[PDB]
Design a protein around this ligand. Structure first.
Ligand SMILES: *[C@@H]1O[C@H](CO)[C@@H](O[C@@H]2O[C@H](CO)[C@@H](O[C@@H]3O[C@H](CO[C@H]4O[C@H](CO)[C@@H](O)[C@H](O)[C@@H]4O)[C@@H](O)[C@H](O[C@H]4O[C@H](CO)[C@@H](O)[C@H](O)[C@@H]4O)[C@@H]3O)[C@H](O)[C@H]2NC(C)=O)[C@H](O)[C@H]1NC(C)=O
Ligand SMILES: C[C@@H]([C@H](O)c1ccc(O)cc1)N1CCC(Cc2ccccc2)CC1
Ligand SMILES: *[C@@H]1O[C@H](CO)[C@@H](O)[C@H](O)[C@H]1NC(C)=O
Ligand SMILES: *[C@@H]1O[C@H](CO)[C@@H](O)[C@H](O)[C@H]1NC(C)=O
Ligand SMILES: *[C@@H]1O[C@H](CO)[C@@H](O)[C@H](O)[C@H]1NC(C)=O
Ligand code: NA
Lengths: 357, 353
């Protein structure tokens, strides 16, 4: 008889719950499970945060889960991160790209198989070296996300340089005063970090100040080429799309494989204690929680469905892959891929705002 | 006059009889609670909210569990219910409370405590020091207040080292020990939780940084309950405690009831309404375009019996009376100073061994 080790999950639907149950079954099939054997425990998202936090306790911590997988529903991973964090039970974010989850003070035992939006700076930087854009203008929203992209790009630049950084208040509709400042500058490569609705305001203002045409380059992320941001986006823009970023099925598959490997590596060590059985009356942390975090943080899974899985110093996915998207005749056209470390251009030619610079 | 339901939640042993001593009037209900885990706190407050029309919560506990503050802030923000952390882990400073929070604490800010610490140092001419923090929220606020104070001063301050220790991982690689070994300063300011400090001190002792010639200054949350002294705490440890002595629990509960009532009276007097207390935690998602933080403008500015009970926008007490405490040779916390209206008054001119 082996020792049954539970793995938790907060997933979108019953289909995804079934995918998780199958991934744990496959983990039991491929691993040596005479000593320890995994068991899938899962739920879907609750209507509100208080209800979600209570479900984590009643449905998952009651089953002594060693880790909890979390996707975005069809309402964020925060009440799960907080509840599991109380006990130092690791949480694996499957689809959240908000940089806030990279903050160790707030998200104490949190890792993710998807990178934060701020990590798109890694692609922009490689794009800058490739096309020899040594002088750029960075336009960011004055929110956490905008500042996260700015700090990440600055870290890489400190070769190519950011001539100026311009911040705007999220929700501002008239950005003509901000863009007039950028127009005065010698640099004609503009990098944007804004949400879907804030990018729309930038594009509209930019077009009116005739900055969306020949001579200019617009280098943007995923959020700024989604929903409404695309309706008013200038032709010629270069944006990014995280390959499999929204595939919950692929991320369950990869997160389960990583966790399965880490559990087995953990049980190669001594004095491994079980997590608490439920929340009621338990106010101490899981003594093995921090060791389990360290084992996960340093796990490498090279043959993942979403690529090479490794985590950084904040437990954010490393070696993520992106589609380099280009808006040609109001259509998003894939012009290349960022394979995890390198830019690969395909045979589809880039069309810059107007023609070719 | 109209009646507002106020729940007073008492965790642990307390004298309910001693505790039991405007446009609106309070209908107070003393509630006993045995457990302080997330489920227990969420469940207790949510059950009370459905049984009575609860306008606000007065929370007091006997623990050293700073997580209680965080659990309470979350409840306060999700339900849009004023909650006051008046004692215990509930009053342990919560940095960066939710935007939607109506959570307020009886205690000093990280920035005020950091200020008091430097006032102690200036008294005994302790200008050469180092800082140690974990990732516990407020660490950035602590280091920043110290730095800005020191930057804008014609005093010979010398910050030698700033260490950031990652308590979310195991110490099998002895990273903390290797980090702590870098300390050379005669004075160390430590910002972390009480459970974190027990570990840090155990390690700092192994490296020999806890003896004579090494003075550790710590905030209120590290000392916590002065009757619970972890064995690993070094003798001669200095802390900035909030006056559990003179500002006793029955006074705090009374003051907490006054803040919720005065605020309610003030909002009713100015807008001819007060927010209808939510009968559910389970409906918060659908019923939130009908809920506001509006009562906060009032809760933050309550004066009662000529005592300015006002709070900061960040949810901490504006003018607390702080006590400077020293862990003596008999392993008991001894009173060695007082912090008034921005004035420090110490017991000793010559700091003793
Ligand atoms: C993302 O894209 C990058 C760029 O292509 C890929 O990185 C390369 O991957 C290949 C394949 O593993 C590596 O190729 C191997 O290179 C060895 C020599 O490398 C040196 O020289 C190159 C060129 O200057 C440098 O880039 C590199 O830094 C080294 O200094 C060869 O000896 C290898 O040949 C041997 O092995 C192959 C199989 O791997 C056999 O077929 C051969 O017969 C032979 O025995 C081989 O060619 C290459 O080094 C990597 N380049 C870089 C820059 O790291 C990533 O793999 C790709 N990532 C993903 C996720 O797909
Ligand atoms: C992550 C830590 C805390 O921020 C911290 C502690 C020590 C550090 O070194 C760094 C950070 N918290 C997260 C919230 C937990 C309480 C909780 C539970 C359920 C719902 C809401 C809130 C209590 C633990
Ligand atoms: C999502 O991922 C799974 C791999 O686990 C794959 O079978 C499926 O086809 C992918 N779907 C899309 C839309 O790429
Ligand atoms: C709490 O513990 C005491 C122990 O004497 C008990 O009387 C009380 O009923 C317990 N609380 C609850 C909610 O049952
Ligand atoms: C606080 O309270 C008094 C009550 O008389 C009020 O008049 C005053 O304007 C308030 N202060 C601020 C700054 O809101
Ligand atoms: Na993390």
């Amino acid at each position: 008889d082996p020792k049954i080790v539970n793995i938790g999950a907060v997933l979108s639907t019953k289909k995804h719950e079934q995918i998780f149950r199958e991934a744990v079954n496959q983990a039991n099939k491929r691993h040596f499970t005479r000593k320890i054997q995994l068991q899938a425990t899962s739920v879907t998202h609750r209507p509100n945060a208080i209800q979600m936090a209570l479900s984590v306790c009643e449905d998952l911590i009651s089953s002594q889960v060693y880790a909890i997988l979390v996707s975005h529903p069809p309402l964020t991973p925060t009440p799960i991160s907080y509840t599991a964090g109380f006990y130092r039970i690791p949480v694996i974010g499957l689809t959240t790209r908000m940089s806030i989850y990279s903050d160790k003070s707030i998200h104490l035992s949190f890792l993710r198989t998807v990178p934060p939006y701020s990590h798109q700076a890694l692609v922009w930087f490689e794009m800058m070296r490739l096309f020899n854009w040594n002088h750029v203008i960075l336009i960011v929203s004055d929110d956490h996300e905008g500042r996260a992209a700015q700090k990440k790009l600055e870290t890489l630049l400190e070769g190519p340089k950011a001539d100026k950084v311009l911040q705007f208040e999220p929700g501002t509709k008239n950005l003509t005063a901000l863009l007039l400042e950028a127009k005065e500058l010698e640099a004609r490569v503009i990098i944007l970090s804004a949400s879907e609705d804030d990018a729309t305001a930038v594009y509209k203002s930019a077009a009116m100040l005739d900055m969306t045409g020949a001579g200019y380059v617009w280098l943007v992320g995923e959020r700024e080429i989604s929903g409404s941001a695309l309706r008013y986006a200038p032709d010629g823009i270069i944006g990014l799309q995280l390959i499999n970023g929204k595939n919950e099925s692929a991320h369950i598959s990869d997160a389960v494989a990583v966790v399965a490997q880490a559990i087995h590596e953990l049980f190669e060590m001594e004095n491994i204690t079980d997590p608490p059985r439920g929340c009621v009356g338990n106010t101490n942390i899981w003594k093995t929680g921090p060791l389990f975090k360290r084992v996960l943080m340093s796990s490498k899974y090279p043959d993942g469905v979403t690529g090479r899985i490794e985590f950084n110093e904040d437990g954010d996915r490393k070696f993520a892959q992106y589609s380099i998207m280009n808006l040609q005749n109001r259509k998003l056209v894939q012009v290349g891929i960022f394979n995890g470390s390198y830019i690969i251009q395909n045979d589809r030619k880039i069309i810059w705002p107007g023609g070719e610079t | 006059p109209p009646s507002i339901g106020i729940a007073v939640i008492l965790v642990g042993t307390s004298d309910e009889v001693a505790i039991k001593d405007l446009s609106v009037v309070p209908r107070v209900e003393l509630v006993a609670m045995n457990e302080t885990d997330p489920k227990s706190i969420i469940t207790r407050i949510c059950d009370l909210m459905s049984d009575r029309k609860i306008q606000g919560v007065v929370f007091a506990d006997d623990t050293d569990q700073e997580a209680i503050a965080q659990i309470l802030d979350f409840i306060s923000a999700q339900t849009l219910t004023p909650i006051l952390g008046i004692h215990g882990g509930s009053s342990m400073i919560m940095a960066d409370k939710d935007e939607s929070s109506m959570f307020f604490q009886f205690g000093p800010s990280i920035e005020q405590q950091a200020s008091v610490m430097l006032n102690i140092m200036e008294e005994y001419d302790w200008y050469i020091f180092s800082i140690v923090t974990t990732y516990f929220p407020g660490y950035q606020d602590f280091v920043n207040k110290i730095r800005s104070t020191i930057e804008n001063s014609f005093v010979g301050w010398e910050l030698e080292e700033v260490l950031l220790l990652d308590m979310s991982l195991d110490d099998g690689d002895s990273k903390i020990q290797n980090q702590l070994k870098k300390l050379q300063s005669p004075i160390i300011l430590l910002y972390c939780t009480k459970e974190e400090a027990t570990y840090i001190f155990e390690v700092a002792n192994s490296v020999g940084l806890t003896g004579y010639g090494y003075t550790w200054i710590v905030p209120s949350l590290v000392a916590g309950d002065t009757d619970t002294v972890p064995a690993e705490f070094p003798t001669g440890l200095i802390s900035v405690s909030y006056d559990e002595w003179d500002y006793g629990l029955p006074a705090r509960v009374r003051d907490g009831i006054a803040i919720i009532t005065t605020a309610a009276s003030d909002m009713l007097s100015e807008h001819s309404f007060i927010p209808e207390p939510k009968s559910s935690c389970y409906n918060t998602h659908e019923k939130r375009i009908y809920q506001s933080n509006m009562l906060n403008r009032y809760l933050i500015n309550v004066t009662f019996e000529g005592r300015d009970l006002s709070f900061s926008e960040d949810g901490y007490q504006m003018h607390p009376k702080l006590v400077i405490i020293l862990l003596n040779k008999e392993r008991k916390w001894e009173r060695v100073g007082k912090w008034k209206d921005k004035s420090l008054q110490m017991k000793y001119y010559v700091w003793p061994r």
